[PDB]
Amino acid sequence: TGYDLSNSVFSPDGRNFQVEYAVKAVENGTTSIGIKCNDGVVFAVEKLITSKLLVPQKNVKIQVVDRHIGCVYSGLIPDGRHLVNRGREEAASFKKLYKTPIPIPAFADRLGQYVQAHTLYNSVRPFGVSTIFGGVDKNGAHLYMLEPSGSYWGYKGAATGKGRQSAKAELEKLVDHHPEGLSAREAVKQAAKIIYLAHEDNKEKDFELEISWCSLSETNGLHKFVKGDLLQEAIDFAQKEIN
Amino acid sequence: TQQPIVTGTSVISMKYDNGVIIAADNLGSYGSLLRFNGVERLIPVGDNTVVGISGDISDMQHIERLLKDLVTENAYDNPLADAEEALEPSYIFEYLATVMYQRRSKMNPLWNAIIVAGVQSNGDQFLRYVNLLGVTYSSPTLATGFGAHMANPLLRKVVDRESDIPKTTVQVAEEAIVNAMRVLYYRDARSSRNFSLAIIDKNTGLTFKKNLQVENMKWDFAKDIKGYGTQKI
């Protein structure tokens, strides 16, 4: 024993226990999801209202990379911000050299290789976040989810944090019941419902819903936050489905 | 240290009662060769600012990318990026002025003269110049290159001091700019007939006009000019 005390050490299993411990920080965080739709992607997150003293709509969690990529994460919030800052530098150097905005699969590997590098040495700690991200590029819509190990795949729907099992079940129903696909406006409504349903795992404190989206038709392939009437319409739809 | 290769000539501008106007022709010269005839030298930043650039075109394209990247960066973690925390003309200018002076101080300048025209949050007109040396100044009219020598005299007849700005309408100001562009086409050997013009108004916003031409030209008196003194036919 002692194999779990230092990052980058293989245990006799062939496991890196420090990475598995980082996953526990992710499992402890609030719920966040992603839904791939017909011509884009939708992101949503659970924000716990710790106190009445929190200013509504101000502590924004979802982050934009370049102008076409959205990023959301569960776990240690500062570690997520560090990863997005790097993502922004990677997207900038890609656009500087190659002119075109970074494709989503290209961007996914840039984050993936950087997270993976923080499992190679004992002088650094792994990332304590799982990050759901994506957007629209020349080849269409793409949704990804990236783990503390550096592992990532493409997704039809993605979920992480404390309510992930609840969310994953709901996402699996949408995939079965909509093989031809889901619209962007539908995906916003469904994203609200899934966060509300996933809130049963964090049910002590009340919460605030936050949604964003990239869609070729609805946002010209740019990342935007869902605000005002369209946000309230999604909240009302979510409130109706739980009752 | 370098030398400019592909170049753009005059950028001209002025304040009027409710905003600012700026203009520049669509040419990229290669010395005396009038090489590129479709070059846009007015570059808008948001809906409140237009940066007009003369001098080296390779350095202009670099600056264009810096400004494009500045908008991207301002949007990051900024819920008020299209409202109270949007980029202002004054912010865009100071950034460019910092870069210009830093580059001259490393003996590797961006070989340009730049005019930032826009309208601020409070409705105030913004118009300020910066060049390859980092020299900056503001005035009710501003112009680069040949425009300094020929356009400013004409534009100063409309707005000679600060107190003339409220008295000047957008029609009068645009007329003065269009005439100045004609005078430059008569007299600047590295100019073109085709140009772009931009109006930034506090009420009506950003109006960007492409593919304008110098018109109502006087050449008829040329038929009566013969020889260089004694020749009668």
Curated annotation (Swiss-Prot), chain A:
Gene Ontology molecular function terms on file: mRNA binding
Localization per Swiss-Prot or TrEMBL: Cytoplasm; Nucleus
GO biological process per UniProt: proteasomal ubiquitin-independent protein catabolic process; proteasome-mediated ubiquitin-dependent protein catabolic process
Superkingdom of origin: Eukaryota
Keyword entries, A-Z: Acetylation, Cytoplasm, Nucleus, Proteasome
Primary localisation category: cytoplasm
Regions that span the bilayer: none
Gene Ontology, cellular component aspect: nucleus; proteasome complex; proteasome core complex, alpha-subunit complex; proteasome storage granule
Note: Present with 12000 molecules/cell in log phase SD medium.
Role: The proteasome degrades poly-ubiquitinated proteins in the cytoplasm and in the nucleus. It is essential for the regulated turnover of proteins and for the removal of misfolded proteins. The proteasome is a multicatalytic proteinase complex that is characterized by its ability to cleave peptides with Arg, Phe, Tyr, Leu, and Glu adjacent to the leaving group at neutral or slightly basic pH. It has an ATP-dependent proteolytic activity.
Known partners and oligomeric status: The 26S proteasome consists of a 20S proteasome core and two 19S regulatory subunits. The 20S proteasome core is composed of 28 subunits that are arranged in four stacked rings, resulting in a barrel-shaped structure. The two end rings are each formed by seven alpha subunits, and the two central rings are each formed by seven beta subunits. The catalytic chamber with the active sites is on the inside of the barrel.
Family from the record: Belongs to the peptidase T1A family.
Protein name, per record: Probable proteasome subunit alpha type-7
Organism of derivation: Saccharomyces cerevisiae (strain ATCC 204508 / S288c)
Organismal lineage: Eukaryota, Fungi, Dikarya, Ascomycota, Saccharomycotina
From Swiss-Prot, chain B:
InterPro entries: Ntn_hydrolases_N, Proteasome_beta4, Proteasome_bsu_CS, Proteasome_sua/b, Proteasome_suB-type
Gene3D superfamilies referenced in this protein's UniProt entry, alphabetically: Glutamine Phosphoribosylpyrophosphate, subunit 1, domain 1 (3.60.20.10)
GO cellular component: cytosol; nucleus; proteasome complex; proteasome core complex, beta-subunit complex; proteasome storage granule
Pfam family membership, one: Proteasome
GO terms, biological process: proteasomal ubiquitin-independent protein catabolic process; proteasome assembly; proteasome-mediated ubiquitin-dependent protein catabolic process
CDD domains found in the cross-reference section: proteasome_beta_type_4
Keywords noted in UniProt: Cytoplasm, Nucleus, Proteasome
Protein location: Cytoplasm; Nucleus
Highest taxon of the lineage: Eukaryota
Family membership: Belongs to the peptidase T1B family.
Subunit text: The 26S proteasome consists of a 20S proteasome core and two 19S regulatory subunits. The 20S proteasome core is composed of 28 subunits that are arranged in four stacked rings, resulting in a barrel-shaped structure. The two end rings are each formed by seven alpha subunits, and the two central rings are each formed by seven beta subunits. The catalytic chamber with the active sites is on the inside of the barrel. Interacts with CIC1.
Role this protein plays: Non-catalytic component of the proteasome which degrades poly-ubiquitinated proteins in the cytoplasm and in the nucleus. It is essential for the regulated turnover of proteins and for the removal of misfolded proteins. The proteasome is a multicatalytic proteinase complex that is characterized by its ability to cleave peptides with Arg, Phe, Tyr, Leu, and Glu adjacent to the leaving group at neutral or slightly basic pH. It has an ATP-dependent proteolytic activity. PRE3 and PRE4 are necessary for the peptidyl-glutamyl-peptide-hydrolyzing activity.
Miscellaneous note of the record: Present with 16900 molecules/cell in log phase SD medium.
Protein name: Proteasome subunit beta type-7
Organism for this UniProt entry: Saccharomyces cerevisiae (strain ATCC 204508 / S288c)
Gene transcribed to yield this protein: PRE4
